Design a protein around this ligand. Structure first.
Ligand code: CYC
Ligand code: CYC
Ligand code: CYC
Ligand code: CYC
Ligand code: CYC
Ligand code: CYC
Ligand code: CYC
Ligand code: 45D
Lengths: 54, 160, 296, 178, 67, 161, 160, 161, 131, 161, 161
């Protein structure tokens, strides 16, 4: 007496070449190295010689 | 100056200045005191406003000063501070002119090519000039906020 | 302080070529964990692969000679080429040299070197400072390095240091294999040309066997150069007609046909029962690391 | 195509010829005599400069194009595509060549306005190879490329302000990339 | 608007024109600053020789006020 | 073209009369609009690229429109539709500051439907492009100014649609 | 392709293809087997070629993924991989066609407008295509490496 | 315009996929045909004037069009037809060498119908001249090269018809 | 032979047996689903081939109707969860030289999931030379 | 303009005799150098924008020219200088392909020196910028092609001097 | 409209030629496929009412299309959508019996694209719906018959594309 309780959600549209969803896991496969928060405040820099002069 | 723009338009039309132009320069000359006050206030408080807006730009866009960005290295962040100084001085020049011609022809026309050659993220500079806008609005009077914000909006839109 | 980076640059200035180079190398060693990470893409390194490829292809002793010529700003074509580059290009070139040394593609430092006291103090000063003025100090230290025609000078030249043991194979004590694998570490291929017969059967990894004594000599002179081999163990068996099949596994601490400093390499020897070495096969055993792949 | 006159300002000494060439240039650029479209002639300075031979007829044509009157007549009341058609008709003497030309001229009209469009379409190699530096532009009857002749005929066979439709809105691409 | 005056001699390399041509062969004309680069590129590409060029109108190095 | 002020002027002039009370009060209404319209124009001009950027990012971006087969594909057509949105935004701002849609249907609607059909551009996709432009402008110009932005951009869509 | 380029060049002068054009097409069609094989090779390593290409790019310019960069999370890095596969496909199209014009038709016309409206640093995109060229030449024959490097180099030049 | 080599590229890129076995086979087929295409193009270019002369001789000459009042009259018009037939032959050669008849409808067929209608050109007479050119070239370039040239010339004629 | 399970000593996994059976049956398209997407093949006297369709090509233009006879094998763990399986057999088909009498060594670097991330075909050579 | 072949042909034609042994020796030399020239051209087409960038950086940036009061000051003049160096690099590459300095004379140096004098451009600064171009391109193309590219850049500088 | 047999007959009549070896081979191919086509027709007419149910359920249910504002909301729109799917299924079955795409050119795809465009109905969603009915029909009709059905359905999509 099995019954098919069809759910609310529409059937998920098949992934295409253009959509980066197929690359999404690849991004997690990449796990690119991020960068720490740069701790510079710019208040102690004085613009008379801190700017390059060559 | 709006006087130069009106003269240019009249010469292009080969006609003397119309009543609209005459009223325009009349309002400009009668209201020159406010523009001079804005210029003096910006010149006096330039060093603090530029530093604060640069700090807020860093807070929005830390990657610009991350190890590998255009602003990374104290030389390469002091150069951002100098560039913001240049743009603030250009805005001050425009405020005392009544039009955006000096802004257009000193730092706006051909800015994209310069920042492509140097590799600077021009959108980051747009955010920086925006932050200059909020800082100037904070330090400066409410009614003059519209006048200063008009020029800041023009610079942001053209250079965005 | 405001003058942290100019004072640090002044401190770097008085350090000699040896101290300057040692401080730079140790700063690269501290890089990432203590100093600023490197993002070479920010600088246009595409104009620098010429010098990097030249230094990689050049031999280790004169590799260090050219590097120290740069350090003391000698008058060489490589020195002028370095001096004609932008500061970011120079710093990226130095970082690429450091990466090559870490991967062994170029001659490393003298073994067990310790930084000088002044250089150690300057490097600690670098470590204390923020990343921005650290990179600024590194740039200002490396810009003046190199020969530019004008007003420049050096006090004392940093001369290159003018400066082999029998290999032990577990489970194998054959004299011929030991002589072969010791002379290659000593680069004594002339001894090996008489150390094997005229068959000349060598098996380069991921290639077909080479045939002919002259072909083997060309392979030894062309391919094998300053190879550092450390056999770990081995096994010997009697092959057909009394031939000795010896499978010896170890590691090679030098780039070798796309091989890292640590790589599980294996050698299969078909040595003549009365002669010496009838066939040699070198195979780089795979692992979860494959940069030598070519697909097809 | 054969029953027309080409105005070459061979010499500026003949003032009558200079005036005739100026009037013909006005007619070609604006499609009409600009008596009922102006309070007074605003191109008097250009006329004087050409009469002294300090500028060439190409410079006079460009000045006519880079004028408030032209943007009042053929740029203000029409979209960019119609402006492209009208400009290429007035100066180059023929309709747009293809979709590449339309794309380019739309790029100039979107980035630098009508003055840049006029300057690029006047200083182009085609303009100099066809009209030179002394000939006022005239209506052309090109054979190539494809559809240039019908588009030019439709452009020139209708009087000024005859209709607001687009003779050459855009060439439908046979092959669509991507 | 920072005008140039240019004296240029553009010869004919392909066609033998049978009518008078000094009006466009050797000419001293006026070209704006913005148009000057394109004009000179066209002249060089046409084989002509720029005999002379000068900034008749405008002041060199004017940082502001170039209209 | 013509705006509300020119509308009253030529409406009075076609009958050859001066400014009657009706023209007087509609001029009062337009003047009362006044500073609001010009302030909205300035705020639109400020982040001018931003409205089109987030409008693309909301509706068109990341879909079959911008995928292969869609008219958005390739960099050329992407930049072309960006230029189209820039035209639409600038002309909407002009109509707003003028207060009349004569500029739109004299500079946009004339042949734009047929010129897209010649290029086979999706009219509907452009429709929700201007739709997204509507709220992207409304989030920066307020409610009433955003309301009139919506009105004029809806007129643009209806002419296009 | 090269045939299309020759046809367009001949059409410009309104003439039949010259013997130089004809025997250039001759050599191209005769040697097309190698070009098709190289396109196959590039297609096969597509997943890996994109993988270490992006890895080397991010290690070279982490700012694009760092705080403030265009592609912060795995989602925008996935979008970068998507564009990266786009331009790999473009280079394959160029290799099979033999001429760069299809690349211009697909991913080079108005690209600056694309990556200015998106804020993407186009120099970083050029570096990513350069990593394409380096790793792909690493995984193929030297002469075939140069054959593909022609198109990778053209894409790089159109980047900067 | 599009050719047999870029036709596969566009067909694969509209869905965004790479070049699969079918595309590879199509490219190899075009490369195999390239030998005959190049030989036919060279031979046609060598003998274009004679081909158009012979086609005009057996299809237009000594007829109502060439007689006074006819569209072949007024020798400028005869040269115009010689030029038109040369154009048709050269563009057919372009299409044959390209392997796709997209240049024909993009640089030849675009606007030709109303061109001839406005000029009052005999469309069927031009079509007959095109088949005469097809027959002349097919008897000079061979069977397969003549096959391809006739295919593209008949595409041009069908566009005309 | 081909229909029956390949008799290999020291190998008791379904993946390797299925790979043997598919290679004998020559259903390389069905053969390669046992491969990893990043998985590669190390051909004899050649560098590793990476890319799934690359291995498809290596099967469908190089591995063309060849018979391999495995004899014995050993299995052990590998770093990163991989399993190193070294299998030795004899090749009864002409495959890069040494007809009938070449000892082929297969180095199966199996994924923790089970797919073969890397497989190397080692043609161990007898005293016969001129290869 | 001219190239090595055209230069040799004109040199032989001015006295109106056939190409003798010396002329064909020169032609052989140019044909041998063509491979190197094409390779260097490919490299420079790769990295023209870069070479301009580090050339100006090591020659112009953070100097007396870029600062306020200098000719390279202002974004407008900076863009003009960038375009000038871009065109110089492109035309030096063109001359390298041709093997002749005629293109530089009749396409880069006629009307440019006195144009700079009219604009007051620093000739001594542009000379050093072109020398930076020389060094940067030498670092990429290699010494063999670098020497000839430096020859062309020196010709540009000497004509500008 | 013509089936495979009538298409072959018309093709032979165009050249005024008898049925050559290709004619008989194509005819025998169609005759061999007739058994499969007839059985697939019986199977598809079996479930033509029910098949479209799961065709739309997995394609156009509980999505943006069905909700208010979507172009499939309201009983007329949903009914017309299911009727359009029924039309596509019936006419593709007709083509499968005939084994030719001629019927779809004039009776289905003729005027359908601009009809949808004027109606404003989403053409792309129709494309995905026809793909979904493609897999649904392939499930019941088998693999080979499924492929024959799918080629015609993809032809309908391409015409609507
Ligand atoms: C003998 C004295 C010379 C000569 C003449 C010649 N002509 C033809 C064929 C044609 N001549 C024309 C000419 C015209 N058609 C026009 O409409 C005009 C006036 C507007 C002219 C001058 C044409 C069109 C034809 C061909 C078509 C037709 O005849 O109706 C021939 C015969 C060519 C052939 O091969 O049939 C000849 C012999 N030829 C010479 O060599 C003498 C110099
Ligand atoms: C011939 C016997 C001598 C000679 C002449 C020569 N002239 C040119 C080129 C030009 N000559 C003119 C002169 C005029 N053009 C006019 O319209 C008029 C006034 C009505 C005159 C006097 C011009 C303008 C040119 C250049 C433009 C052009 O070619 O149309 C050349 C060719 C130069 C070249 O190669 O460019 C020559 C040879 N040269 C001699 O040696 C003879 C003594
Ligand atoms: C990655 C290393 C760099 C980068 C890329 C990046 N791109 C996007 C988004 C898009 N890229 C495209 C480009 C194309 N689509 C096409 O059809 C063509 C030709 C085939 C091209 C060139 C498009 C259209 C988008 C928009 C999204 C979509 O594809 O539908 C992003 C994300 C942008 C966002 O905010 O979502 C990124 C990050 N950016 C960098 O900084 C890197 C250097
Ligand atoms: C963008 C909102 C949608 C889109 C459109 C799209 N447009 C084109 C090409 C052109 N669009 C125009 C626009 C105009 N012409 C006018 O006269 C007016 C009024 C000023 C407008 C707005 C023009 C001129 C062109 C062609 C010229 C050019 O390219 O600059 C395309 C490309 C068509 C092609 O490749 O042939 C596209 C894709 N596409 C979308 O996805 C959006 C929904
Ligand atoms: C800072 C937030 C951004 C940034 C800035 C930055 N600028 C430079 C270098 C220069 N900036 C200018 C700009 C101007 N010069 C002018 O005359 C005008 C108007 C008065 C402007 C706007 C110039 C000319 C330079 C070149 C150096 C010089 O002036 O001599 C740098 C250095 C880049 C480098 O490679 O050295 C930087 C970092 N960069 C960012 O990423 C931010 C968005
Ligand atoms: C950069 C290395 C130097 C520099 C540049 C600079 N140039 C101008 C203005 C112009 N430069 C040209 C150049 C050319 N025209 C040609 O036909 C050729 C052949 C390729 C070249 C190189 C032209 C025509 C102009 C004027 C027109 C225009 O600028 O568009 C400027 C601007 C000067 C000013 O604005 O007054 C500058 C700054 N400046 C330096 O200091 C460098 C040494
Ligand atoms: C369902 C997959 C999609 C959909 C359907 C839909 N269609 C209409 C309206 C019409 N459909 C047709 C099509 C045909 N009629 C025929 O006789 C044939 C010949 C084979 C075809 C293909 C026509 C002509 C109409 C217009 C008349 C009618 O009312 O049926 C609608 C309603 C449109 C309306 O405005 O009421 C709908 C909803 N809609 C979707 O969103 C689905 C993707
Ligand atoms: C992040 C970032 C970057 C910057 C990146 C950075 C910071 C790059 C810098 C990296 C650094 C600091 C590299 C150091 C290299 C030093 C070497 C190779 C010296 C070796 C010396 C030896 C072998 C000597 C040995 C010896 C010998 C032989 C003797 O004789 C005896 C003793 C002695 C010890 C002397 C970029 C610029 C790329 C982009 C922008 C950006 O933000």
């Amino acid at each position: 007496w099995q019954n098919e309780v069809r759910r609310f959600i529409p059937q998920e549209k098949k992934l295409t070449a253009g959509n980066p969803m197929n690359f999404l896991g690849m991004a997690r496969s990449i796990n690119p190295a991020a960068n720490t928060i740069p701790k510079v405040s710019a208040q102690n820099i004085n613009i008379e010689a801190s700017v390059p002069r060559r | 100056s709006i006087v130069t723009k009106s003269i240019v338009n009249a010469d292009a039309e080969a006609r003397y200045l119309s009543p609209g132009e005459l009223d325009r320069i009349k309002a400009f000359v009668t209201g020159g005191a406010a523009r001079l006050r804005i210029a003096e206030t910006l010149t006096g408080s330039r060093e603090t406003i530029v530093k604060q807006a640069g700090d807020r730009l860093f807070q929005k866009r830390p990657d610009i000063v991350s190890p590998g960005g255009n602003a990374y290295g104290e030389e390469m962040t002091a150069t951002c501070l100098r560039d913001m100084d240049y743009y603030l001085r250009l805005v001050t020049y425009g405020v005392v002119s009544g039009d955006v011609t000096p802004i257009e022809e000193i730092g706006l026309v051909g800015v994209r090519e310069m920042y492509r050659s140097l590799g600077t993220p021009i959108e980051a500079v747009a955010q920086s000039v925006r932050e200059m806008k909020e800082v100037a609005s904070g330090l400066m009077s409410s009614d003059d906020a519209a006048e200063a914000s008009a020029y800041f909006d023009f610079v942001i839109g053209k250079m965005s | 302080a405001a003058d942290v980076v100019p004072a640090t640059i002044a401190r770097f200035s008085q350090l000699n070529a040896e101290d300057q180079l040692a401080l730079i190398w140790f700063a690269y060693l501290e890089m990432g964990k203590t100093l600023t990470i490197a993002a070479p893409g920010a600088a246009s390194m595409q104009l620098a692969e010429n010098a990097l490829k030249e230094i990689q292809a050049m031999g280790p002793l004169q590799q260090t000679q050219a590097m120290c010529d740069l350090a003391n700003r000698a008058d060489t074509p490589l020195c002028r080429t370095y001096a004609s580059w932008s500061p970011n290009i120079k710093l990226g070139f130095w970082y690429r040299l450091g990466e090559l040394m870490e991967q062994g593609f170029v001659a490393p430092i003298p073994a067990g070197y310790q930084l000088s006291a002044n250089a150690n103090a300057v490097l600690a000063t670098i470590q204390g400072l923020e990343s921005g003025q650290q990179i600024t100090v590194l740039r200002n230290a490396v810009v003046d390095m190199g020969f530019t025609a004008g007003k420049d000078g050096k006090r004392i030249a940093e001369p290159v240091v003018p400066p082999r043991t029998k290999v032990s194979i577990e489970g194998v004590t054959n004299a011929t294999v030991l002589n072969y694998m010791d002379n290659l570490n000593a680069n004594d291929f002339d001894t090996l040309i008489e150390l094997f017969t005229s068959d000349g059967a060598l098996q380069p990894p991921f290639q077909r066997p080479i045939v002919g004594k002259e072909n083997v000599l060309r392979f030894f002179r062309e391919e094998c150069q300053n190879l550092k081999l450390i056999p770990e163990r081995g096994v010997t068996e009697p092959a057909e007609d009394g031939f000795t099949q010896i499978k010896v596994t170890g590691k090679v601490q030098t780039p070798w046909f796309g091989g890292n400093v640590g790589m599980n390499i294996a050698w299969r020897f078909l040595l003549n029962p009365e002669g010496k070495i009838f066939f040699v096969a070198i195979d780089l055993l795979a692992s979860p690391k494959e940069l030598l792949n070519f697909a097809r | 195509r054969q029953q027309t006159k080409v105005f070459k300002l061979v010499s500026t000494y003949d003032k009558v010829a200079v005036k005739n060439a100026i009037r013909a240039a006005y007619r070609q650029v604006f499609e009409r005599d600009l008596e009922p479209y102006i309070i007074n002639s605003e191109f008097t300075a250009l006329e004087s400069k050409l009469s002294n031979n300090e500028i060439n007829v190409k410079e006079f044509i460009e000045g006519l194009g880079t004028s408030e009157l032209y943007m009042k007549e053929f740029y203000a009341p029409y979209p960019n595509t119609k402006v492209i058609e009208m400009g290429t008709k007035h100066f180059l003497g023929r309709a747009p060549l293809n979709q590449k030309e339309i794309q380019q001229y739309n790029q100039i009209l979107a980035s630098q306005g009508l003055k840049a469009f006029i300057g690029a379409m006047v200083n182009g190699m085609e303009y100099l190879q066809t009209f030179g530096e002394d000939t006022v532009p005239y209506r052309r009857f090109p054979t190539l490329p494809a559809a240039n002749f019908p588009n030019t005929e439709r452009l020139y066979n209708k009087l000024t302000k005859q209709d607001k439709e687009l003779v050459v809105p855009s060439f439908t691409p046979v092959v669509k990339v991507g | 608007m920072r005008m140039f005056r240019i004296t240029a001699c553009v010869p004919s390399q392909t066609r033998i024109r049978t009518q008078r041509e000094l009006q466009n062969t050797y000419f001293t004309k006026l070209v704006p600053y913005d148009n000057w680069f394109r004009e000179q590129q066209r002249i060089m590409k046409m084989g002509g020789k720029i005999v002379k060029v000068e900034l008749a109108t405008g002041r060199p190095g004017t940082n502001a006020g170039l209209a | 073209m013509q705006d509300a002020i020119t509308a009253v002027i030529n409406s009075a002039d076609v009958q050859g009369k001066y400014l009657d009370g009706a023209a007087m009060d509609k001029l009062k209404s337009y003047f009362a609009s006044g500073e609001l319209r010009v302030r909205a124009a300035s705020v639109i001009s400020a982040n001018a690229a931003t409205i089109v950027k987030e409008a693309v990012a909301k509706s068109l971006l990341y879909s079959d429109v911008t995928r292969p087969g869609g008219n958005m594909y390739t960099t050329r057509r992407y930049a072309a539709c960006i230029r189209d949105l820039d035209y639409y935004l600038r002309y909407a701002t002009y109509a707003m500051l003028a207060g009349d849609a004569s500029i739109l249907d004299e500079r946009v609607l004339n042949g734009l439907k047929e010129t897209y059909n010649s290029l086979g551009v999706p009219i509907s996709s452009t429709v929700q492009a201007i739709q997204a432009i509507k709220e992207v402008t409304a989030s920066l110009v307020g409610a009433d100014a955003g309301k009139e932005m919506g009105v004029y951009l809806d007129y643009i869509c209806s002419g296009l649609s």
